[PDB]
Structure formats: structure tokens, C-alpha cells
Design a binder for this molecule. Structure first.
Ligand code: HEC
Ligand SMILES: COc1c(O)c(C)c(C/C=C(\C)CC/C=C(\C)CC/C=C(/C)CC/C=C(\C)CC/C=C(\C)CCC=C(C)C)c(O)c1OC
Lengths: 125, 55, 352, 431
């Protein structure tokens, strides 16, 4: 499933006050149960990277965010291997759990989709 | 370079069993594969020795 | 064939063969460099490998330095092994093999590395540019090899023929008994060397003034000035350099370095302003040029420039020593300028 | 060749050499970075920097004197060089700065301008001097939570939080008389100097002793400063070495000479009689390496440092180097030992007898502070020549064989394997 598609559905829910008040609280509870924040991770650090879109995206990420993602990932592996969680004061806070890689991913999917469209454009005379 | 790396046969052993880079966090669930190779060996060895007496 | 020496009760001796074959005399660009890099390679009776293996067991090492004027073959070792190193040095000067493969496998690579190290230091790129513009073809000759003009194995051989002669070299053993030294030198192959001519000219080099060069460079920016000195007027510039590089001068923290290159027929005074951003390089040199034009000294650094010029125990053959105790004032006539680095944001010879 | 030293009220140590053009005089205190705390770390370096301040330095330049200072781990030194005749004016400047101006150097205009200089100084070090930076961190992890772990230049954080009072507090606890030695090298006589010293009386804080602490200890460990933006990998690895005044002080230094130092770009270096070179030159495992036997008051470090651009073969570099060191316990040859003796003498000579008296002072000062005297260069050679293969083996079997190590590195060190892999190579399998 593409991020363009997840964004389409997600944004539609976020705009409509009917769904927005019904779902978000469910989603918030789902995120806390997930537990990734207790390992010091941000959701975007969890995205499977072994594909061209994600490689293009990670390549375009500014240095500072890149070194940060690296530390968070290494810290998560070390904590996982010790069968512990990080001290609560080190957990990622909701304010910090921002979709930092999302804009780069969406941009790459659009560029990719346009190429696919242009390589297959039909012509009518 | 080290002999385990230069020799044609040993380098296979080295790249698969000695220097093979493993993710630091794999847990005991990742031990099943070696257990399967071991099982394969136990079945083959015991079967050949029994075949010697089977009709 | 001057054989100097100076015994002492210390355990480490140091034989040295100065030879007038630096870049100043170089027939082709960098040939002196290549020859210096060729010393201690294979001789006709001893391979470079054996020389090292043998000297290591005795307890001594070799080394071959290059100057703008000299090519010194020094040898540090344990006192009582003197004869060995005399003959080793003799062997090199008289019969190094010069095999074509030694050129391609050891000499060229070693020289390429030398040029590479120097190509990354902006002050040295400047110092080279300074010499090239002041002395347009004498001491302004390229110090290291860079391949601009071809240099075959023969050219290196021909140059060794000119430079390696009894009438163009000087033996000098520090911490060695002059008695045995002269004896061994004459008993060795030094005396068999075909003594040619001494290329050391006494006439002052035809220097130029009011010359400037600008080189674009990625890294630190550096502005430098160079002044051609006289054979007698060099003692004042010496104190000048030590003054600018001391707590006495206020503008000592505005420059990276300042020195006087003393030769046999004159000299060269250099001032280096080096820093990351161009803005700081511009101001720091523009200030120096202004403060030096309205020159001053009064010779307060007379005892300092005399003390710092004495800590050089290896050059106990220096020119004038008491000439310092004379002149006490300095101005700033015409000089030479070189901008290296962020050129488009660096001063010109005009606004200085 | 003479090491003269006498005590009257202060301990005076000198070593004359008439052929020397200049003379160096200075005081060497028996306390350095190893005496500091994690929080005032960098105070000694700070002292050195004001002693060389533009103000104090200009006063000595007018008089024709040159200043020099060195901050080490076990000691600290302040030196003034001069002509053989002005040997008296050096003492005037020495006393004028350590008693008269022990309050004029610490002005709120001089201190701030100096603090700003050691900050840009220590920062530049950490940002660019990778080999020394790595060697400093090696001491840091090897001797963690112990005196020898503190870096000589101090840390940026303890430095920027330092004040005039910290300098004073340190000065009033270590710059004492019982923790000092006045040294003089150059050409001046012992009787010549001691008179000018015993002339001017006044004790100034006599009977006072410096504070004590806890003994230094080696801890097998590592610190990895990975930085993939650097173009090379710089590593240092070592075992617990020998403290100065150790029976094996020389055996250790000889052992390090066996493997010596190397530089891949220097033709002559590639030809040395070192077995390790056959292994490392085939695929060019490194640009350079150098072994050392660092000795201090309570302990030392024996190992090597190296730099390399061959980032995918770092494991071979470490592996071949450690296999060679294994040899010292089991198969080092007579000729390797003999080659080492000769080269050790040559380097030990070039150190103890250079054309610079300031180096002589530091060497003399540092030695007399620890053992109360200095072993003559000729006395060393007697000890060096007496070393047998059997000695090196007994030493290695105690210090190198199956012993913990300490590691430090920076740059592209992804290829430097884990601790246990390195540690396992400190020995060999046998029947
Ligand atoms: C000849 C070599 C040989 C190989 C190779 C071998 N077997 Fe067998 N196996 C036999 C013989 C002989 C029997 C009959 C003896 C017996 O019943 O155990 C047998 C019987 C069996 C049986 C019946 C066990 C029972 O209830 O008696 C199973 C199940 C079995 N093998 C599984 C395997 C599996 C799984 C493998 C391989 C991964 C394997 N065998 C490989 C020879 C072999
Ligand atoms: C990246 O992750 C990895 C990983 O790569 C690897 C390699 C392993 C390690 C595990 C393995 C290498 C398993 C490999 C197993 C095999 C290749 C099985 C091969 C099987 C055989 C049965 C060989 C054939 C044997 C015979 C013919 C011999 C039997 C006959 C005999 C003794 C003759 C007897 C007769 C007489 C007369 C005496 C991991 O654990 C792992 O994750 C942590």
C-alpha cells in the first residue's frame, strides 16, 4: 500500500468531524499499545526501507535528521537485545513522533507515478 | 589476507559461518534454522545405518 | 671537499654530506627532487634492501633531504661505527644503479606523494609562488616534480653527474673525531669522485619587485608577502621576523608565520597570513602592510633575535652574527604579494 | 654525561654540556593532569597558557628570554631559555612570575582572553587531530575512573566552566615546594646555579603537602568514535604496560621496537627487518602504524596505533598484528631481539641527546621527580644489551598472552570487529 493511498484515506477521515472524533482516539490508543515509543523510535523509523521509494527518500533526508534516525535505530536494537525498555524519561513523546520522512516519500511516489504515466501515454489524432 | 578468506573452500565457510554479519538483536526464534540443518543430518545418518540392515 | 667535524662525549654521531644540487641548480623541473628521492636506492654492490637490513643491525639510519639550494645525505648512528656510514654515503654518490624499474616502482611514487602532501598546504603553494615571482628563474625554480616537462631516467643520471663531484660537495660530521673522519673520507670513494665545478655563484640573484600572483584554492585562504634581501642587509630582516613572531609585536597574533630564508648569495623574507574566511585574511594583511609602511623597531628584540638565532646548534657555520648589534630601524619598500584561496574576496597589491 | 642533583631547601637538578650555545632553566612540579578531577580537568593546561600569555611573554622577550611549558600526566613544567650569560636573569623572571606576579597574571582581562584561546585550541584538537585524539581516548577508556584517564588538554566542558579561583586552588595545593624540582640544562654548572638559588632565601608555603588519591588501574575495554565522514580509520590498541621504575621497563620498550613504526609511502620504511611487513604490504592494510611503550608513575600502556584507508580489511590489519605479538611469547628470534637492541639505542640516544636543552630539561625533570635521580644514557645501554630472548618471552607471557586489551578508534571503523574477536587473538590454539 502506497503512502499516497494511506494519506488519501487518512486525510478524508481527519477532515470530516464525524469520523475525526470517532477514529483518532482509537488510533491514539493503537499507537500507545504498539510500544515503539518505549524503545525510542518514531513511527517513520519503522517503515520498511528495502525498496526504491524509501531509498530515494532516505537519500534526500537532511544530514541532521539522518544521523538522528541512525542513533534511534541503533539504540532500539541494543535495548531490544537487552530485553528492556528505555527509562520512561527517554521515551519518544507524541509531540516528537512526527512524520518527518513522509513528505520525502510522498514526493518520490508522485515523481514515480508521473514517470509511469508518461512512459505509457497514448496519443489521439 | 587471512587464509580462511583466501582459500576457495574456506572462504565459503567464512562468509556463511564465521564473518557473516548478523543483526545484533535477533532472538532465540532465529535459532530454528540451524536446528533444521541438524535434524536433516540426524535423519540422513540414522537412515543410512539402518538401510544397511533393511529389506 | 671541505671536511668539518666536532667531537664530543655523546654516544650518537651524525655524518652528513651537503651537496649543492637543490632546485636552484636543477636543469629540468623537479629533477633535483627525483634525484633526492633516488638516493639510498640500489648501488652497484649493495641493494637498498641490504643497506637497510645492515644499518638496522648496526644501529643507524639514513635520510636524504632537499632544499632550494642543497641535497643533504645525512646518517645518524652509534659513534664507533663511523667507517661504515662513510663508505655507505660514498657508495651512493659514486655508484647508484639507476635501474628503470626503480624509477617506476619506488622513485616516482615517493615523489608523487611528496607533491600531493605539498599540494594541500596553502602556505606552501604561496611560498612557492613567492620564489617564482621574485627570482624569476634561479631560486624561483619549482622545488618538487610535477610532470609539466618530461624527465627521463637519463636526465636524472645527467644531473647526478653534474652535482655529485668533489668540488661541489662538503662532508660534515657532527660528534665525530675530525682525525678519523678526514682519514676515512680520503681512504673511501669520496676522493675518487671526479671533482668538477662549484655551481655556487657569488653574484646576487636578479630579483624583481612589485610582482603579484593570485591562485584559486579550495580550503584556507592565505595572503603572503615576499621581500628580496641583500647579503649585508639580512641581519635586520632576521630580527624583523623574530619581532613579528614574538610577544613584543602587537600584530604577532595577526599573522601565521614570518621568516628569513638565508642562502649563500642573499635571502628572502616571507610573511604569511592564513585563516578560514577571506574577510579575516584581508584585514589582517592590510593592517600589517599599513603598520610596516609607517615602520618602527628601536631594536628591543635585539637580545631575543640573538637568542632565538642561537638555538640552531646544527648551523654552527652561519653568516654574520654581530651585524645584529647595529641597525635598529625598519621601513617597507616595494615587495611581492600572493593571494591564495578565496581570491575574489582577497586584497590586491593596489589597496595594500 | 654528568647528572648532578643536590637538596638544601629545594631540590636542584642539572646536567651541563659546554658545547651548547644556550641554557634552559625551569621548575618542574610533581603533579599533572593525573592529579586533576573530572570537573577541574584542564586547569594545568590553563596555567601553562597564561604563563605563555602575551603579557608575561613580552616581559621575557624584552629581556631576551624565551618561554616554554609542557603539561603531562604525572608532571608539569615551566621553562625559560636564555644565553649562557643571562642564566641569572632567567631566575629573576621565574621568581617574579611564581611569587610576585602570582596575582598579576590572573587578571579578569588576561584570564578571559586566554580561556578563549585554550577553548579554540582544545576544540581544534578534537575536530582534527584524529591520531592524538584517538590516543587520548585510549588512556581515557583504559584507565577509566582513575587518574590516568583525564586528558592533558582538559575537556571543553570542564574548561568553559573554569574560573580564576580554580587556578588558585590548584596552585596552592600542587605548586608547593615538596612537590617541585628546579631544573637547569644547557651549559651552566651545577655549582653555578645552586648558588643563585641558595642566595635568595624565603620558603613560601613550606611543609605543605599535596592531596592524595586512589591508585591507577587498567580496565580492558573500548571506546568507538565512529565517523563515516572521515576519509580514514585511526585506531589504537594496547595492553597494560610498565610503569617507570619497573624491572621490565626496558624489556617492554625493546618489544615495541621489534614491531617498530611504519610508513607505506617511504621506500626505506617498506624494507625494514619486520616480519609483520610481509603480511601487511600485499594488500596494503594501512598507511602507517607505530608501536609504543608508554610509561607513567603507576602504570603504562603497551600497544600500537595505526591509520588506514583500506576500510574493508581492517580485520586483517588487526589479525596479522596480533599474530605477530603472539610470537613474543613463543617464537621471537635472537636476530629480532638484536635488531631491536640496536634500534632502541639509536632512538633512546636521539631523545636523551638532541640539540635542544628544553627537551633535556623535561626528560631530566620528569625522571628525578619519580626516582630521585636520572639513569645515565650509558647505564641504559648496559641494561638494553643484557636482555635475552628468554626475557622478552617471560615478559610477553605475562603482559601480552591472553590478556585484556583496550581499544579506541575514530573514522570509518565499521570494519573493526567486536571486542571479543580482537581479544581472542591475544593467543593461539595449541595441543
Ligand atoms: C536410507 C537413508 C534414509 C534417509 C536418507 C532417510 N531415511 Fe527415513 N527411513 C529409512 C529407513 C531404512 C526407514 C525404515 C526404518 C524405520 O522405520 O525407522 C526409514 C523410515 C522413516 C520413517 C518411518 C519411521 C517409523 O515410524 O519407523 C520416517 C517418518 C522417516 N524415515 C523420515 C525421514 C525423513 C524426514 C528423512 C529425511 C529428512 C529421512 N527419513 C531420511 C532410511 C532413510
Ligand atoms: C544469516 O543467518 C544464518 C546463517 O547464514 C547460517 C549459515 C547459520 C548456521 C546454520 C547452518 C549453516 C545450517 C546448514 C546445514 C546444512 C548445509 C545441511 C547439509 C546436510 C547434509 C545431510 C550433508 C550430507 C552428509 C553425508 C552424506 C554424511 C553421512 C554419511 C556417512 C557418515 C557415511 C557412514 C558410513 C561408514 C562406512 C562409516 C545461522 O544460524 C544463521 O542464523 C543465525
Amino acid at each position: 500500500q502506497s503512502f499516497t493511498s494511506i494519506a488519501r484515506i487518512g486525510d478524508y477521515i481527519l477532515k470530516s468531524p464525524v469520523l475525526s472524533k470517532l477514529c483518532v482516539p482509537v488510533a491514539n490508543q493503537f499507537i500507545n499499545l504498539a510500544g515503539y515509543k518505549k524503545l525510542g523510535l518514531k513511527f517513520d523509523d519503522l517503515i520498511a526501507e528495502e525498496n526504491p521509494i524509501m531509498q530515494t527518500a532516505l537519500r534526500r533526508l537532511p544530514e541532521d535528521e539522518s544521523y538522528a534516525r541512525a542513533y534511534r535505530i541503533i539504540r532500539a536494537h541494543q535495548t531490544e537485545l537487552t530485553h528492556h525498555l528505555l527509562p520512561r524519561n527517554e521515551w519518544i513523546k507524541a509531540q516528537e513522533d512526527v512524520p518527518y520522512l513522509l513528505p520525502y516519500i510522498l514526493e518520490a511516489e508522485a515523481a514515480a507515478k508521473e514517470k509511469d504515466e508518461l512512459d505509457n501515454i497514448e496519443v489521439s489524432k | 589476507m587471512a587464509f580462511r578468506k583466501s582459500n576457495v573452500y574456506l572462504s565459503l565457510v567464512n562468509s556463511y559461518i564465521i564473518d557473516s554479519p548478523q543483526p545484533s538483536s535477533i532472538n532465540y526464534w532465529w535459532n530454528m534454522g540451524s536446528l533444521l540443518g541438524l535434524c536433516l543430518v540426524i535423519q540422513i545418518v540414522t537412515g543410512i545405518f539402518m538401510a544397511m540392515h533393511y529389506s | 671537499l671541505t671536511v668539518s667535524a666536532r667531537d664530543a662525549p655523546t654516544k650518537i654521531s651524525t655524518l652528513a654530506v651537503k651537496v649543492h644540487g637543490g632546485s636552484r641548480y636543477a636543469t629540468k623541473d623537479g629533477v633535483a627532487h627525483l634525484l633526492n628521492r633516488f638516493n639510498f636506492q640500489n648501488t652497484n654492490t649493495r641493494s637498498a634492501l641490504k643497506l637497510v637490513r645492515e644499518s638496522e643491525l648496526l644501529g643507524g639510519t639514513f635520510k636524504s633531504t632537499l632544499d632550494r639550494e642543497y641535497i643533504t645525505l645525512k646518517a645518524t648512528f652509534l659513534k664507533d661505527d663511523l667507517p661504515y656510514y662513510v663508505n655507505a654515503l660514498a657508495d651512493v654518490l659514486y655508484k647508484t644503479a639507476f635501474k628503470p624499474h626503480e624509477l617506476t616502482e619506488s622513485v616516482l611514487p615517493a615523489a608523487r606523494y611528496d607533491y600531493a602532501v605539498a599540494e594541500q598546504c596553502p602556505v606552501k603553494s604561496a611560498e612557492d609562488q613567492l620564489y617564482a615571482i621574485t627570482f624569476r628563474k634561479g631560486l624561483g625554480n619549482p622545488l618538487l616534480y610535477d610532470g609539466v616537462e618530461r624527465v627521463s631516467l637519463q636526465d636524472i643520471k645527467d644531473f647526478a653527474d653534474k652535482v655529485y663531484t668533489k668540488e661541489n660537495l662538503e662532508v660534515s660530521g657532527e660528534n665525530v673525531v675530525e682525525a678519523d673522519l678526514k682519514r676515512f673520507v680520503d681512504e673511501s670513494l669520496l676522493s675518487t669522485l671526479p671533482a668538477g665545478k662549484s655551481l655556487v655563484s657569488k653574484s646576487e640573484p636578479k630579483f624583481f619587485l612589485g610582482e603579484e600572483n593570485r591562485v584559486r584554492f579550495i580550503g584556507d585562504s592565505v595572503a603572503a608577502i615576499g621581500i628580496p634581501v641583500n647579503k649585508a642587509s639580512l641581519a635586520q630582516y632576521e630580527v624583523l621576523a623574530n619581532y613579528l613572531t614574538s610577544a613584543l609585536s602587537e600584530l604577532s597574533g595577526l599573522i601565521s608565520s614570518a621568516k628569513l630564508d638565508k642562502f649563500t648569495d642573499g635571502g628572502l623574507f616571507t610573511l604569511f597570513v592564513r585563516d578560514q574566511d577571506s574577510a579575516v585574511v584581508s584585514s589582517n594583511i592590510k593592517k600589517i602592510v599599513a603598520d610596516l609602511k609607517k615602520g618602527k623597531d628601536l631594536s628591543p628584540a635585539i637580545n631575543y633575535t640573538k637568542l632565538k638565532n642561537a638555538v640552531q646548534n646544527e648551523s654552527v657555520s652561519s653568516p654574520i652574527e654581530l651585524n645584529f648589534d647595529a641597525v635598529k630601524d625598519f621601513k617597507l619598500g616595494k615587495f611581492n604579494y600572493v593571494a591564495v584561496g578565496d581570491v575574489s574576496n582577497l586584497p590586491y597589491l593596489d589597496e595594500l | 654525561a654528568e647528572v648532578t642533583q643536590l637538596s638544601n631547601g629545594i631540590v636542584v637538578a642539572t646536567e651541563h654540556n659546554p658545547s651548547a650555545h644556550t641554557a634552559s632553566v625551569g621548575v618542574v612540579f610533581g603533579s599533572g593532569a593525573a592529579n586533576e578531577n573530572p570537573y577541574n580537568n584542564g586547569v594545568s593546561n590553563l596555567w601553562k597558557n597564561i604563563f605563555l600569555s602575551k603579557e608575561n611573554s613580552a616581559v621575557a622577550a624584552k629581556e631576551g628570554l624565551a618561554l616554554s611549558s609542557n603539561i603531562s600526566r604525572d608532571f608539569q613544567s615551566y621553562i625559560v631559555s636564555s644565553l649562557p650569560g643571562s642564566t641569572d636573569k632567567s631566575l629573576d623572571f621565574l621568581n617574579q612570575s611564581f611569587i610576585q606576579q602570582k596575582a598579576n597574571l590572573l587578571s579578569s582581562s588576561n584570564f578571559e582572553a586566554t580561556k578563549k584561546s585554550v577553548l579554540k585550541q582544545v576544540q581544534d584538537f578534537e575536530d582534527n587531530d584524529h591520531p592524538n585524539r584517538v590516543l587520548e581516548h585510549l588512556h581515557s577508556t583504559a584507565f577509566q575512573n582513575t587518574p590516568l584517564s583525564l586528558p592533558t588538554r582538559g575537556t571543553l566542558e570542564s574548561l568553559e566552566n573554569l574560573v580564576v579561583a580554580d587556578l588558585e586552588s590548584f596552585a596552592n595545593n600542587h605548586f608547593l615546594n615538596s612537590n617541585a624540582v628546579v631544573v637547569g640544562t644547557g651549559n651552566i654548572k651545577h655549582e653555578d646555579l645552586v648558588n643563585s638559588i641558595e642566595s635568595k632565601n624565603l620558603s613560601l608555603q613550606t611543609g605543605t603537602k599535596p592531596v592524595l588519591k586512589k591508585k591507577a588501574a587498567f580496565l580492558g575495554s573500548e571506546v568507538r568514535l565512529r565517523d563515516d565522514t572521515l576519509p580514514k580509520a585511526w585506531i589504537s590498541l594496547a595492553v597494560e604496560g610498565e610503569p617507570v621504575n619497573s624491572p621490565n621497563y626496558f624489556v617492554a620498550k625493546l618489544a615495541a621496537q621489534i614491531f617498530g613504526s611504519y610508513n607505506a609511502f617511504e621506500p626505506a620504511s617498506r624494507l625494514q627487518g619486520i616480519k609483520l611487513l610481509d603480511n601487511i604490504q600485499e594488500y596494503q592494510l594501512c598507511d602507517n602504524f607505530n608501536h609504543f611503550s608508554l610509561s607513567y608513575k603507576d602504570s603504562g600502556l603497551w600497544g600500537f596505533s595505526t591509520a588506514t584507508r583500506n576500510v574493508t580489511m581492517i580485520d586483517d590489519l588487526i589479525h596479522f598484528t596480533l599474530k605477530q605479538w603472539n610470537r613474543l611469547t613463543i617464537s621471537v628470534t635472537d636476530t629480532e631481539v638484536e635488531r631491536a637492541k640496536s634500534l632502541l639505542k639509536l632512538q633512546l640516544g636521539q631523545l636523551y641527546e638532541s640539540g635542544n636543552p628544553v627537551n633535556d630539561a623535561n626528560l631530566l625533570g620528569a625522571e628525578v621527580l619519580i626516582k630521585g635521580s636520572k639513569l645515565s644514557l650509558g647505564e641504559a645501554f648496559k641494561k638494553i644489551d643484557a636482555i635475552t630472548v628468554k626475557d622478552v618471552k617471560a615478559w610477553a607471557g605475562k603482559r601480552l598472552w591472553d590478556q585484556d586489551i583496550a581499544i579506541a578508534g575514530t573514522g570509518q571503523i565499521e570494519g573493526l570487529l567486536d571486542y571479543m574477536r580482537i581479544r581472542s587473538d591475544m593467543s593461539m590454539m595449541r595441543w
